[PDB]
């Protein structure tokens, strides 16, 4: 400490080093919008072509669910069984488990369930992936001159782009939206009936005439003695053209005429699946979902990708352009550039205050050197603990600017003060003064990390969010202190200009300086009156409690959030059609939306990206917005935008169309809102479970005062068509049940049969009915089976037919049949309360109706008992720290009593600005407690030291302290309030967060000082008047 | 028994294409054989956990 005061250059070297390591941790540091925040989930997705919901549930799912045992750190297992034939089992794991090890554990338990699976499933593939929902980017590809359809493009992507993007550096994963080329063979059932043939033969023939076969080798090993030719055999080669697939022979007739495939069915290169069809401004487009690599730079991955695509552009088909539907990146560009704008500015502000307050250049260059260094160094402290330049850590630094600023200031001010007071040289003034603030600065570090660290040890995804802030902030802080002990004292004693004893630069200059008297006089006024109050303090206790209570009411009556919403230049709208509607009708609506946006939002919307899929019944539309710059208004912002969209599609539409903005943390809890699981426990039936579900919907429909918008999260039972095969009639007339089945299948379901080699890439061979002969129930009739004898038999000869109900989506939670009920709490009431009333209502249900919690309300049912404890620790540790610094159990109470003085402001700040008690308002709120405590501690320190090291009296010593201490206090807070204010009143991108930090902090700061510089004195004085007896107000020694 | 240009765009290239976002991949090189063997070597940054 002192040591450096006598060594300017050694400190210069610790400084130069910190600057360089931070500079390096800057040059080689990851940037991303957020950190990994969400618990790890691994999803097993597989599909069973043609299967219905109970099919996959009873063929694939339950066999997989039962084979999923003994996998490490299981949290919860939830799966969808779809009538679209797809089944997905998401296993979410314990927070901070090794993604990669858990995911390997699952793919190796599945690789054991594999042999107990359907062969259709086993051959379409059962897959394992790690589930983020956070694609860095989604690239679209289109053709301008109407040239190709969706499926053509899908292929172009899968054979020209997906492959070179996953070669773009910075790109961690590529996923594909659409379906690759396939040999699509569409049976015409009549022309099939002619030659007395079935699908089954079509399959057979196709496998037979199309294959590779293990050929072998001429002159193989061992060859015979002397042998001289050694080379490979080329055999039956898989088919290449659609033509060659036409020229495959199905039955050679008697009359010399041959029957080809070309004849019995139509043949075309077509889509592997037509569930999902995608339209970008109406033109057909096919797409890519790119995920950011682990540790990789978001902004550079995206730029490298864009460079990859322009570099491919000299090789494209005509009018085939790349489009960029979703890019989370430029919002991150603006976020980063705006937080830097803040840091630079707030530095410039502190210079401005420091000058227009010490009117002395070389002093004013000191704190300017200081914090930059603390910055750089903290980036380097983060890089050491494995972090990245992301949202949470950067607003952690913005938030930290205050402790940083007060720390540099405290020092240079104390020096200048001691010089103006006693007339010491620069150096000797420093040591006097550094020797005065030393213990205080160390103690403040122990108390500041006494509040800032407990919050790092928060659990769950919530806890993760806190971890980012807490580490950013604490390191910035402890460093601000080591800088304040090594560098600043060194830069003070070395380059600070010496001040004439009893200078105060009063009057003196005119142009620039009338202020000094005017400040001077007033600080006198101030302290006169400080004294003035210290006569009767009682009234001031009255008002104090009043402020406390007011703070309480303000606190409770303020809205509890999780984060703020961000117009990200992009949002989405989702479309729900009447159950069983058509690909084409859903598509009508999606076009309607596409046009609405392309009409009454001509100035804001650049592009609409509609996707029909997940089952004809429902479509979704990705709405992209024009750049922020040409969207000025309060109305050209997403809130009002989605307002008018949903306003449009609510009344004047045929099916439900919500328009919404995606939250910034893309996968956690809607604050007041839960995710209920209604779990069937006993050997019950799906019918009984639904009955229980609507029953609970009713029990909550009875409580509009507690719960709000309680809704199930599934699909209802739709009418499904049942074709009962009478084994007797069919086995009688001569048709093998296999044949009736797989003909019914390969007719209406479709069938993967063979593999063919298109343009050198292996694609699939799908044979199914032509569209028209497999649409309507009566058409069942056009299909016949060749019996054992040789006769064709219609299905109505051995098939009964009826309509029934069934559900398209069979949900399972942790093994058993279950049903997901989403919900949120009433306007007034806390989420947990509504969760509790839900546990009381799901307790009101019939035998076998159990309940459980998942996702959001799980992450909250964990960390709902932790919040008070970390802060009980925080209070015991801060008090212990201050008792340490001083020498008192009771003197601390002076500085702790300050905490409210900042709160009353922040609550008042948000409320009277109409905001909400979120995280940013909280880290900010803490930050405020931090300064309250700092200033108060410096006052109390100076008070005690004057008292003990100069035997001075109480009232007089505190008075003197609060007096010499005022000028810097004001400096600090002036520097802040100005630096923060922009954050409080900015628009453009991200202004939701910015304003969230700002408002709370600012209001807090204001009440903080202009309440402390009157209450702290009274604390120290009134507190001290519950200590010992004799002596006193001594004035001796 | 299959031939090299046969195996390579069906088995080699199809596997290589999925090998992105491999942590610390330095360089990736693979052989496609008419003796039927197909082999893909992934060499990594010095000291990545094998
Ligand atoms: C950076 C600018 C700071 C300077 C501006 C602040 C100066 C004035 C702020 C004072 C706020 C508290 O208000 C102050 O309270 C005490 C009363 O308790 C008054 O003081 C007076 O009243 C009480 C009587 O009840 C007496 O004990 C005391 O003899 C007398 O000083 C002050 O006249 C008043 O100004």
PDB file of N, CA, C and O and ligand atoms in Angstrom, chain A residues 519 522-523 525-536 539-540 966 970 1013-1014, ligand 1:
ATOM      1  N   UNK A 519     -19.816  26.556  -3.567  1.00  0.00           N
ATOM      2  CA  UNK A 519     -19.821  25.215  -2.967  1.00  0.00           C
ATOM      3  C   UNK A 519     -19.474  25.294  -1.500  1.00  0.00           C
ATOM      4  O   UNK A 519     -20.197  24.783  -0.643  1.00  0.00           O
ATOM      5  N   UNK A 522     -21.884  26.631   1.028  1.00  0.00           N
ATOM      6  CA  UNK A 522     -23.006  25.708   1.171  1.00  0.00           C
ATOM      7  C   UNK A 522     -22.642  24.494   1.976  1.00  0.00           C
ATOM      8  O   UNK A 522     -23.454  24.023   2.770  1.00  0.00           O
ATOM      9  N   UNK A 523     -21.412  24.004   1.835  1.00  0.00           N
ATOM     10  CA  UNK A 523     -21.093  22.839   2.630  1.00  0.00           C
ATOM     11  C   UNK A 523     -21.078  23.312   4.053  1.00  0.00           C
ATOM     12  O   UNK A 523     -21.507  22.589   4.951  1.00  0.00           O
ATOM     13  N   UNK A 525     -23.138  25.682   5.276  1.00  0.00           N
ATOM     14  CA  UNK A 525     -24.559  25.615   5.574  1.00  0.00           C
ATOM     15  C   UNK A 525     -24.922  24.201   5.992  1.00  0.00           C
ATOM     16  O   UNK A 525     -25.434  23.956   7.091  1.00  0.00           O
ATOM     17  N   UNK A 526     -24.439  23.269   5.180  1.00  0.00           N
ATOM     18  CA  UNK A 526     -24.797  21.870   5.311  1.00  0.00           C
ATOM     19  C   UNK A 526     -24.491  21.363   6.695  1.00  0.00           C
ATOM     20  O   UNK A 526     -25.374  20.888   7.421  1.00  0.00           O
ATOM     21  N   UNK A 527     -23.250  21.571   7.096  1.00  0.00           N
ATOM     22  CA  UNK A 527     -22.772  20.975   8.312  1.00  0.00           C
ATOM     23  C   UNK A 527     -23.328  21.753   9.470  1.00  0.00           C
ATOM     24  O   UNK A 527     -23.676  21.127  10.470  1.00  0.00           O
ATOM     25  N   UNK A 528     -23.499  23.076   9.321  1.00  0.00           N
ATOM     26  CA  UNK A 528     -24.175  23.836  10.371  1.00  0.00           C
ATOM     27  C   UNK A 528     -25.437  23.088  10.678  1.00  0.00           C
ATOM     28  O   UNK A 528     -25.687  22.653  11.802  1.00  0.00           O
ATOM     29  N   UNK A 529     -26.181  22.823   9.612  1.00  0.00           N
ATOM     30  CA  UNK A 529     -27.510  22.289   9.807  1.00  0.00           C
ATOM     31  C   UNK A 529     -27.459  20.853  10.166  1.00  0.00           C
ATOM     32  O   UNK A 529     -28.372  20.383  10.800  1.00  0.00           O
ATOM     33  N   UNK A 530     -26.403  20.152   9.786  1.00  0.00           N
ATOM     34  CA  UNK A 530     -26.286  18.768  10.232  1.00  0.00           C
ATOM     35  C   UNK A 530     -26.292  18.754  11.745  1.00  0.00           C
ATOM     36  O   UNK A 530     -27.048  18.010  12.416  1.00  0.00           O
ATOM     37  N   UNK A 531     -25.484  19.677  12.252  1.00  0.00           N
ATOM     38  CA  UNK A 531     -25.366  19.894  13.666  1.00  0.00           C
ATOM     39  C   UNK A 531     -26.747  20.234  14.123  1.00  0.00           C
ATOM     40  O   UNK A 531     -27.220  19.692  15.099  1.00  0.00           O
ATOM     41  N   UNK A 532     -27.364  21.180  13.438  1.00  0.00           N
ATOM     42  CA  UNK A 532     -28.673  21.648  13.828  1.00  0.00           C
ATOM     43  C   UNK A 532     -29.633  20.520  14.157  1.00  0.00           C
ATOM     44  O   UNK A 532     -30.433  20.617  15.098  1.00  0.00           O
ATOM     45  N   UNK A 533     -29.534  19.420  13.416  1.00  0.00           N
ATOM     46  CA  UNK A 533     -30.516  18.376  13.629  1.00  0.00           C
ATOM     47  C   UNK A 533     -30.053  17.512  14.782  1.00  0.00           C
ATOM     48  O   UNK A 533     -30.853  17.008  15.562  1.00  0.00           O
ATOM     49  N   UNK A 534     -28.745  17.387  14.920  1.00  0.00           N
ATOM     50  CA  UNK A 534     -28.180  16.514  15.919  1.00  0.00           C
ATOM     51  C   UNK A 534     -28.535  16.932  17.345  1.00  0.00           C
ATOM     52  O   UNK A 534     -28.180  16.251  18.304  1.00  0.00           O
ATOM     53  N   UNK A 535     -29.209  18.063  17.484  1.00  0.00           N
ATOM     54  CA  UNK A 535     -29.761  18.478  18.765  1.00  0.00           C
ATOM     55  C   UNK A 535     -30.941  17.576  19.094  1.00  0.00           C
ATOM     56  O   UNK A 535     -30.785  16.679  19.913  1.00  0.00           O
ATOM     57  N   UNK A 536     -32.117  17.789  18.505  1.00  0.00           N
ATOM     58  CA  UNK A 536     -33.210  16.817  18.693  1.00  0.00           C
ATOM     59  C   UNK A 536     -33.173  15.802  17.563  1.00  0.00           C
ATOM     60  O   UNK A 536     -33.392  16.173  16.422  1.00  0.00           O
ATOM     61  N   UNK A 539     -37.363  13.378  16.225  1.00  0.00           N
ATOM     62  CA  UNK A 539     -38.237  13.624  15.060  1.00  0.00           C
ATOM     63  C   UNK A 539     -37.731  12.884  13.829  1.00  0.00           C
ATOM     64  O   UNK A 539     -38.495  12.383  12.981  1.00  0.00           O
ATOM     65  N   UNK A 540     -36.420  12.788  13.786  1.00  0.00           N
ATOM     66  CA  UNK A 540     -35.737  12.246  12.657  1.00  0.00           C
ATOM     67  C   UNK A 540     -35.790  10.723  12.737  1.00  0.00           C
ATOM     68  O   UNK A 540     -35.757  10.033  11.715  1.00  0.00           O
ATOM     69  N   UNK A 966     -18.412  15.060   2.763  1.00  0.00           N
ATOM     70  CA  UNK A 966     -19.480  15.458   1.857  1.00  0.00           C
ATOM     71  C   UNK A 966     -18.958  15.609   0.426  1.00  0.00           C
ATOM     72  O   UNK A 966     -19.347  14.841  -0.454  1.00  0.00           O
ATOM     73  N   UNK A 970     -20.639  13.573  -2.882  1.00  0.00           N
ATOM     74  CA  UNK A 970     -21.321  14.243  -3.943  1.00  0.00           C
ATOM     75  C   UNK A 970     -20.655  13.948  -5.272  1.00  0.00           C
ATOM     76  O   UNK A 970     -21.335  13.696  -6.267  1.00  0.00           O
ATOM     77  N   UNK A1013     -26.444  11.711   3.780  1.00  0.00           N
ATOM     78  CA  UNK A1013     -25.663  12.839   4.268  1.00  0.00           C
ATOM     79  C   UNK A1013     -26.399  13.619   5.367  1.00  0.00           C
ATOM     80  O   UNK A1013     -26.010  14.727   5.733  1.00  0.00           O
ATOM     81  N   UNK A1014     -27.515  13.069   5.824  1.00  0.00           N
ATOM     82  CA  UNK A1014     -28.226  13.580   6.975  1.00  0.00           C
ATOM     83  C   UNK A1014     -28.551  12.455   7.942  1.00  0.00           C
ATOM     84  O   UNK A1014     -28.809  12.710   9.094  1.00  0.00           O
TER      85      UNK A1014
HETATM   86  C1  LIG C   1     -24.716  20.025  -1.074  1.00  0.00           C
HETATM   87  C2  LIG C   1     -25.758  20.958  -0.464  1.00  0.00           C
HETATM   88  C3  LIG C   1     -26.068  20.668   1.056  1.00  0.00           C
HETATM   89  C4  LIG C   1     -26.585  21.943   1.759  1.00  0.00           C
HETATM   90  C5  LIG C   1     -28.096  22.019   1.801  1.00  0.00           C
HETATM   91  C6  LIG C   1     -28.630  21.438   3.172  1.00  0.00           C
HETATM   92  C7  LIG C   1     -28.772  22.599   4.205  1.00  0.00           C
HETATM   93  C8  LIG C   1     -30.132  22.616   4.853  1.00  0.00           C
HETATM   94  C9  LIG C   1     -30.750  21.127   4.896  1.00  0.00           C
HETATM   95  C10 LIG C   1     -31.355  20.824   6.254  1.00  0.00           C
HETATM   96  C11 LIG C   1     -32.359  19.643   6.338  1.00  0.00           C
HETATM   97  C12 LIG C   1     -32.673  19.298   7.833  1.00  0.00           C
HETATM   98  O1  LIG C   1     -33.294  20.484   8.402  1.00  0.00           O
HETATM   99  C13 LIG C   1     -32.555  21.191   9.433  1.00  0.00           C
HETATM  100  O2  LIG C   1     -33.044  20.579  10.680  1.00  0.00           O
HETATM  101  C14 LIG C   1     -32.706  21.309  11.959  1.00  0.00           C
HETATM  102  C15 LIG C   1     -33.732  20.930  12.827  1.00  0.00           C
HETATM  103  O3  LIG C   1     -33.575  19.603  13.274  1.00  0.00           O
HETATM  104  C16 LIG C   1     -32.749  22.857  11.787  1.00  0.00           C
HETATM  105  O4  LIG C   1     -31.895  23.390  12.748  1.00  0.00           O
HETATM  106  C17 LIG C   1     -32.499  24.195  13.675  1.00  0.00           C
HETATM  107  O5  LIG C   1     -33.759  23.622  14.288  1.00  0.00           O
HETATM  108  C18 LIG C   1     -33.672  22.868  15.556  1.00  0.00           C
HETATM  109  C19 LIG C   1     -34.917  23.163  16.296  1.00  0.00           C
HETATM  110  O6  LIG C   1     -35.869  22.125  16.092  1.00  0.00           O
HETATM  111  C20 LIG C   1     -32.520  23.196  16.512  1.00  0.00           C
HETATM  112  O7  LIG C   1     -32.194  22.098  17.411  1.00  0.00           O
HETATM  113  C21 LIG C   1     -31.260  23.728  15.888  1.00  0.00           C
HETATM  114  O8  LIG C   1     -30.825  24.707  16.919  1.00  0.00           O
HETATM  115  C22 LIG C   1     -31.359  24.502  14.628  1.00  0.00           C
HETATM  116  O9  LIG C   1     -30.154  24.303  13.823  1.00  0.00           O
HETATM  117  C23 LIG C   1     -32.232  23.383  10.492  1.00  0.00           C
HETATM  118  O10 LIG C   1     -32.525  24.836  10.432  1.00  0.00           O
HETATM  119  C24 LIG C   1     -32.802  22.658   9.353  1.00  0.00           C
HETATM  120  O11 LIG C   1     -32.270  23.238   8.083  1.00  0.00           O
END
